[PDB]
Amino acid sequence: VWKDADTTLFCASDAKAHETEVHNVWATHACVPTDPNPQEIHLENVTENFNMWKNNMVEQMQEDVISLWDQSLQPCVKLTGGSVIKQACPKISFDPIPIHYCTPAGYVILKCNDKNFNGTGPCKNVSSVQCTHGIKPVVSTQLLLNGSLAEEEIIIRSENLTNNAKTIIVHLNKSVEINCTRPSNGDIRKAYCEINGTKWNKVLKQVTEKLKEHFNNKTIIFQPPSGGDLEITMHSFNCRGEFFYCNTTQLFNNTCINGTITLPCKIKQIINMWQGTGQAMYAPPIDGKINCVSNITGILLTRDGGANNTSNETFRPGGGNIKDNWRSELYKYKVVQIE
Numbered sequence: 108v109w110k111d112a113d114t115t116l117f118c119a120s121d122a123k124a125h126e127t128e129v130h131n132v133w134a135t136h137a138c139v140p141t142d143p144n145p146q147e148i149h150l151e152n153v154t155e156n157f158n159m160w161k162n163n164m165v166e167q168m169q170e171d172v173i174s175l176w177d178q179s180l181q182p183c184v185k186l187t188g189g190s191v192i193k194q195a196c197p198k199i200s201f202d203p204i205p206i207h208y209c210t211p212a213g214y215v216i217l218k219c220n221d222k223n224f225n226g227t228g229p230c231k232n233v234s235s236v237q238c239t240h241g242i243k244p245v246v247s248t249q250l251l252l253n254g255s256l257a258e259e260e261i262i263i264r265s266e267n268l269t270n271n272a273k274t275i276i277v278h279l280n281k282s283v284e285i286n287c288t289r290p291s292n293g294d295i296r297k298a299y300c301e302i303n304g305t306k307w308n309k310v311l312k313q314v315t316e317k318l319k320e321h322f323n324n325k326t327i328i329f330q331p332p333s334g335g336d337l338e339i340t341m342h343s344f345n346c347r348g349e350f351f352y353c354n355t356t357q358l359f360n361n362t363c364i365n366g367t368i369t370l371p372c373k374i375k376q377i378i379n380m381w382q383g384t385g386q387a388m389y390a391p392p393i394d395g396k397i398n399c400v401s402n403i404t405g406i407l408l409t410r411d412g413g414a415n416n417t418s419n420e421t422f423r424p425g426g427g428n429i430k431d432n433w434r435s436e437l438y439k440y441k442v443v444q445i446e
């Protein structure tokens with residue numbers, strides 16, 4: 108006998124105590140070991156309702172990542188709400204590790220196993236677990252990096268598609284590599300990312316096909332972001348502690364719907380913080396080759412307003428609300444209380 112409930116969750120990880128990598132240190136102090144023999148239980152003949160858009164798990168993971176980042180990536184200058192904070196800022200070691208979220212006694216996590224599950228409504232194949240799978244707290248905009256894949260078809264997610272103010276999460280079923288590089292000795296801040304364009308265009312082809320199923324077979328057009336700050340108009344993310352800002356115009360160019368695509372990037376020290384309402388200044392990049400190779404696993408889209416009287420829909424890449432990054436992995440779970 109169970110009902111929807113929110114409770115305070117705990118985490119589990121495979122953090123190495125000896126590692127100075129800042130996620131390992133965090134999890135070492137803040138999580139417990141993973142259960143080497145987790146036990147999923149499948150529930151016959153039970154339908155359960157889910158709502159990825161209103162899920163307290165999402166608020167708890169966000170709290171964790173804000174706390175991880177507050178203790179490990181301190182800027183030299185923090186400008187948060189009418190104040191200024193000069194403070195030390197050494198270069199650190201940085202590479203996200205999977206984190207599991209688990210329920211305490213009296214509770215359990217239900218997991219939606221339906222393979223087309225769009226994140227809202229009823230779920231036919233529901234099971235129960237002590238813990239979610241391990242989720243890398245990857246902070247980025249525009250493209251979801253190193254997450255999980257949709258198991259069958261590309262899946263379109265949104266709290267309400269008819270409403271264009273609401274972000275769309277596209278869940279890929281086949282990842283595409285993005286190889287990102289700040290080459291060593293010029294412009295220390297200069298970088299690029301490379302993507303196999305044959306792969307990428309075949310995927311963007313399939314996404315347009317999918318979007319037409321939700322938008323009445325209208326014509327699907329991709330465009331670069333309108334305005335907003337740099338963290339949004341570009342694919343922004345963190346690579347070995349460096350904040351990379353990448354121009355995705357070539358990713359979102361409806362024409363090619365074939366070779367290596369080279370996105371130009373710039374490392375920035377001054378940034379608008381994702382944790383909200385404030386800019387921070389970080390230290391200049393470490394020397395040497397700086398490289399992250401990442402799996403693109405989702406896309407974040409914002410749809411254009413005012414296209415009702417045409418046969419077009421226009422999608423621009425978006426993001427900015429990091430809560431949605433965690434929703435893209437947490438959509439398949441809801442906490443319930445047992446009695």
Ligand SMILES: NC(=[NH2+])NC[C@H]1Cc2ccccc2[C@@H]1NC(=O)C(=O)Nc1ccc(Cl)c(F)c1
Nearest residue numbers: 246247248338343344379380381383384385427
């Ligand atoms: N204005 C701010 N200051 N923070 C507020 C967030 C919330 C929000 C909602 C919609 C659109 C943009 C934003 C702001 N998000 C960002 O500042 C942001 O996401 N920046 C950020 C910063 C660093 C990295 Cl690696 C990254 F991926 C993102």
Ligand SMILES: *[C@@H]1O[C@H](CO)[C@@H](O)[C@H](O)[C@H]1NC(C)=O
Nearest residue numbers: 259260261262280281313317
């Ligand atoms: C991904 O989904 C599309 C439909 O959206 C489907 O046509 C295709 O077969 C899937 N690709 C993979 C890798 O299974």
Ligand SMILES: *[C@@H]1O[C@H](CO)[C@@H](O)[C@H](O)[C@H]1NC(C)=O
Nearest residue numbers: 225227228229263264265268
């Ligand atoms: C998800 O499925 C539900 C009904 O099962 C439907 O109401 C909703 O429109 C779907 N969401 C999206 C974004 O496709």
Ligand SMILES: *[C@@H]1O[C@H](CO)[C@@H](O)[C@H](O)[C@H]1NC(C)=O
Nearest residue numbers: 266267268269270271272273
């Ligand atoms: C979805 O958005 C549309 C457009 O704003 C709006 O008419 C409607 O109220 C929303 N749907 C729901 C279920 O609230």
Ligand SMILES: *[C@@H]1O[C@H](CO)[C@@H](O)[C@H](O)[C@H]1NC(C)=O
Nearest residue numbers: 284286287288301398399400
């Ligand atoms: C990624 O980028 C560069 C080539 O531009 C190279 O040094 C590195 O080995 C590449 N890695 C992969 C996995 O392609």
Ligand SMILES: *[C@@H]1O[C@H](CO)[C@@H](O)[C@H](O)[C@H]1NC(C)=O
Nearest residue numbers: 302303304305306307309366
């Ligand atoms: C790029 O993609 C094409 C088609 O997906 C593939 O056949 C080719 O091997 C790839 N090129 C690279 C990066 O080796």
Ligand SMILES: *[C@@H]1O[C@H](CO)[C@@H](O)[C@H](O)[C@H]1NC(C)=O
Nearest residue numbers: 318319320321322323324325
């Ligand atoms: C899109 O096109 C096919 C016919 O070409 C049709 O079967 C399907 O109903 C259409 N989908 C819509 C409008 O959602």
Ligand SMILES: *[C@@H]1O[C@H](CO)[C@@H](O)[C@H](O)[C@H]1NC(C)=O
Nearest residue numbers: 331337340341354355356357
């Ligand atoms: C991205 O690069 C293109 C180069 O064609 C440029 O025109 C565009 O304004 C750039 N976007 C941003 C965010 O500066």
Ligand SMILES: *[C@@H]1O[C@H](CO)[C@@H](O)[C@H](O)[C@H]1NC(C)=O
Nearest residue numbers: 252253344345399400401402
């Ligand atoms: C994605 O995963 C790869 C392999 O673990 C890692 O090298 C890279 O740093 C990750 N990407 C980001 C943006 O954190």
